[PDB]
Design a protein around this ligand. Structure first.
Ligand SMILES: Cc1cn([C@H]2C[C@H](O)[C@@H](CO)O2)c(=O)[nH]c1=O
Lengths: 289, 289
């Protein structure tokens, strides 16, 4: 698709200290791979090869060294900086030149998704010609998230950021698909009651035009909380369980790129040569033979 | 008390890629805290306030970033670089000026110990007037480690690396105490068949002089493998289980410094302020009240 992706990987906050004294949160391992691999692979599964990584002045070079320009994966990776964490909607203001007049998508750098049918779900969001698509996930504590109520036709009826006051149990997750209107909408967002340039404001605008579609991630879908140390440990336990007990690989960009045809097997084998020592590399070998 | 400590944190190796593409192995989080905190707190529990961190050219500034000079913990941290991974014994040549004519201790940057009687075990080793002390951990498969056989008085009689026939079930761990002879002893080590200046040669010299004592860590002690992604995850699970079920922290330098009297309660409250968000900081608050 001509859709282009943004990962917002900015300020984690002190919540994960002292672990995050060492590194920024989206570079911490979730099981065997850096956190940023999971939302990146989400964009890749949706078909986006053009990805803008937005991070802090201090951390952007660290991502640059980890990921490079993405040509090793048949991708084009670019970088821009958020000087202060003023809101998710700022991603489209920082990302205006990279987006051009293409449809776009935003995923948060600490959002980890899993689902057996997730790729058909992503591809379907990518196929909407217009409007916006958010992803709804059942949680037991909606007051901590953005909450949506929708018309069962996939049409949202209300959307509230951290309501006192919650109108449903469906949290809006950190994955958003948009047509060409979002940049101008984002530029017009005013700071919310909590002082933030909220993506919820963006989605409310789409909802008022009747252009907010909601994809449900119900039974079988995982959306991992990376907010706390305990929830980070749970995220690692989950990924390790899928890979060791069920023989599944989550968020391996080399595999996704090869199976998407963005690199060939010769390019893929070249990627494995410096990784031959451990199971991550031996998996890429097992998948080549 | 007058003893000075070294942490040797060497090359991560491709074994933990791609996670260690982002961060050095000894900066990976073990539950809520960077790995390096664990061997550090071990030196701290032994009473050492002066610690030299030896690492690779590429990784040494990262540790300085995380830890600073240690003055926040009433300590004095210094840094030197191992230019090439030519063996563990080099730490005593590199650290020769830091050591002076003092007793010393060496711990490997990836060694995580826990046991109810660990501090008394360390202090007893620290109290040795002369000679050297190694720390042996009871294993069910001694053939996989370097094995020490010792007399009924705690004096080492043999030390063999990966014995096809074990003379004991006690593996030598990466924690070593030495008198003032070690800097000179290390200088006399010849390169092994591994092309490295091995600590085993250092320990052999003390044993050849009949001055190698062995502390055994049996019932009640844990010694965690950090070699693989699976074992790293299990290490995190271990720490999280003990800390949440038993109301204790493993390798919390702030706590060790406060309880040892190296900082006062006002100083400790200052350190806690940036950690208020999580369970690590709120633990320190509970002990303040
Ligand atoms: C509000 C905000 C959050 N974030 C990131 C940090 C959080 O880990 C995550 C929120 O789930 O998104 C940014 O990168 N920039 C911002 O402006």
């Amino acid at each position: 698709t001509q859709r282009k992706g943004i990962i917002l990987a900015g300020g984690s906050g002190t919540r994960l200290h002292p672990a995050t004294l060492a590194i920024s949160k989206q570079l911490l391992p979730v099981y065997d791979k850096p956190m940023i691999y999971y939302p990146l692979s989400t964009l890749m599964l949706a078909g986006m090869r053009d990805v803008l990584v937005i991070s802090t002045p201090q951390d952007t070079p660290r991502f640059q060294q980890l990921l490079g320009d993405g040509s090793q994966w048949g991708m084009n990776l670019q970088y821009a900086v958020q000087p202060s964490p003023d809101g998710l909607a700022q991603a489209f203001i920082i990302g205006e030149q990279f987006i051009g007049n293409a449809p776009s998508a935003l995923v948060l750098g600490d959002n980890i998704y899993y689902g057996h049918d997730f790729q058909p779900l992503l591809k379907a969001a990518d196929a909407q010609s217009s409007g916006a698509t958010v992803f709804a996930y059942h949680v037991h504590d909606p007051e901590r998230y953005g909450v949506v109520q929708f018309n069962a036709q996939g049409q949202a009826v209300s959307i509230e950021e951290k309501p006192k006051a919650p109108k449903s149990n469906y949290a809006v997750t950190g994955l958003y698909f948009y047509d060409q209107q979002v940049v101008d909408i984002a530029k017009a967002v005013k700071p919310s009651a909590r002082g933030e340039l909220e993506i919820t404001s963006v989605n409310q605008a789409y909802m008022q035009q009747g252009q907010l579609n909601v994809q449900t991630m119900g039974r079988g879908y995982a959306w991992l909380d990376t907010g706390t140390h305990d929830s980070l440990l749970d995220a690692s336990q989950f990924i390790a369980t899928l890979e060791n007990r069920q023989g599944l690989k989550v968020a391996c960009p080399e595999e996704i790129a090869w199976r998407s045809g963005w690199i060939n097997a010769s390019q893929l084998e070249a990627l494995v040569q410096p990784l031959t020592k451990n199971g991550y590399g031996q998996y890429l070998m097992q998948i080549l033979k």
